User: Fold Copper efflux oxidase,Multicopper oxidase from Hafnia alvei.
Amino acid sequence: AEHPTLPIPALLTPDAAGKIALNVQTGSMKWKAGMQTPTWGINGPLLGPAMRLQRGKDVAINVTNALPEATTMHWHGMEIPGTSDGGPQAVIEPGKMWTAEIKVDQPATTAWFHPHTHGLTGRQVAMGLGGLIIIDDEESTKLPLPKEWGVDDVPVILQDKRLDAKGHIDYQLDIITAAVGWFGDMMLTNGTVYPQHLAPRGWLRLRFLNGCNARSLNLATSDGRPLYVVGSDGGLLGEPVKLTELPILMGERFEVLVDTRDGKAFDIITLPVKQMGMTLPPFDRALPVLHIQPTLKSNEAKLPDALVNMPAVPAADNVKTRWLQLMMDGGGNKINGIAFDMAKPMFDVKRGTYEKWTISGEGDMMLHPFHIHGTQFRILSENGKPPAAHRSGWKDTVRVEGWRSEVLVKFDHEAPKERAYMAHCHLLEHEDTGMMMSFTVS
Ligand SMILES: [Cu+2]
Ligand SMILES: [Cu+2]
Ligand SMILES: [Cu+2]
Ligand SMILES: [Cu+2]
Assistant:
C-alpha cells in the first residue's frame, strides 16, 4: 500500500535535425526521511531518458556536461565505431558538449548508456548517471509483443545504493570496495524504493537492466509465476525461454514477458546470491523490487511461439584465439599481468572477422561479468558449462567466476588507437582499479 509509483524514463526520438540532446546535470532524490540526497542524472535528478532509435537510421547525440567535473558517456551494447563509443578517451569537460554520430546497424534490443570515465566509472554510475537505448527494427515490430511504452512495455533499472548518516551517497574507493565492489543497503527500481506499476491484463514486457556497480541479482516472481525470457543484451532470442529464476549480472539486459491475464497482483523479487558482500540485509531474504498490479483494461499481446531467426553459431575452426587472464593477485587488479594502461591497446583485430576469445578467472573466486565494447557476440562456453537457453543468443557480457569462459566475437566497426574499444569486468570497481583493457579494430 505505502509505496511510490514506478517512474517511466521519457522515450526521446531523434528530432528534425536527426539529433538527440542529453544534458548531464546535478539534482537530488528524497530517500532518507527529510533528507535530499545530492545525485547526478541525464535530463533529470537521476538516471536518464530512453533513446528510441530505428535500425538503419542515423542520430547525432549532443552530450552536454553540466556537472562540476569531467565525464564520458559510453553506449553499452552498441555496435558502433570506437570514435563514437564514448570510452575513457572521449572526455567531456565540464561546460562542454561532445557529439556521438551513431548509425544503428544491429537487431532490436534494450541497450543502455552510462559514463566510462577513467578510474571513475563506478563513482559516476553510483552518483546517478545512466540511461536506456531502445532499438527498433521491422522484424521485431511484426511480433505481437507489448509495445505501449510505460504501460505494457516497461523499463526496469535495478541498482542498489549506499547512503551515509547525512543522507549523501557513500562511495569510497578503499581496498574493500575495490576488491568486493560497491554495494548498499537500499534497493532502487528506476531510482525508487519498491515502486508499483499498473499494467493491462494480457502480457507485460519488462526490460530488465541490472544497473548495480557490483551487485548481481536473481529475479523471480513472488507467486511462482513464470518469467518468459524473450530477449537478451543484444536482441530477441529465437523463441521464448520459460524460467522461474533469472540471474542478471551487472550491465546485463533481459527482456521478459509476464502473464497478467489472471488479473492478480504480484511482485518481481530478487533472491539472495552467493556473491561476496551481497548477502547482508535486506538482501538476506527475497526482496520485492517492483509491484505489478494488473488493471481492469487489457492488451492484445500474444507471447509468440517463435521470435526472430536466431542464426546458428558458426564453427570458428581457424580463427585467431585470445587469452585474457583476469587477476586480483598481489598488487591489485590486472589483465594479463598488465593493469589497464590506456596508452597501449593489447592487440589489433581485423574488422569483419570472427575470433574466439577466452577470459579466465581461475585463481580468484570473484564474479566477473566480462563486457566487450563495440560488439554483440555468442557465448560458446560460460564458466565451463555451455550457456543457458536464454544466455545463448546475443550477449555483450559473459560470466567469468572462478573458471574460464569462451565467446565468438566479431567486430564490424573500426576503432583506432586514439579511440580504441574496451574489454573489462563490469564490476565497475574492478574495472576502475585496473581490470580493463583496450584493443583496436581496422
Ligand atoms: Cu557498461
Ligand atoms: Cu560496452
Ligand atoms: Cu571483476
Ligand atoms: Cu564498458
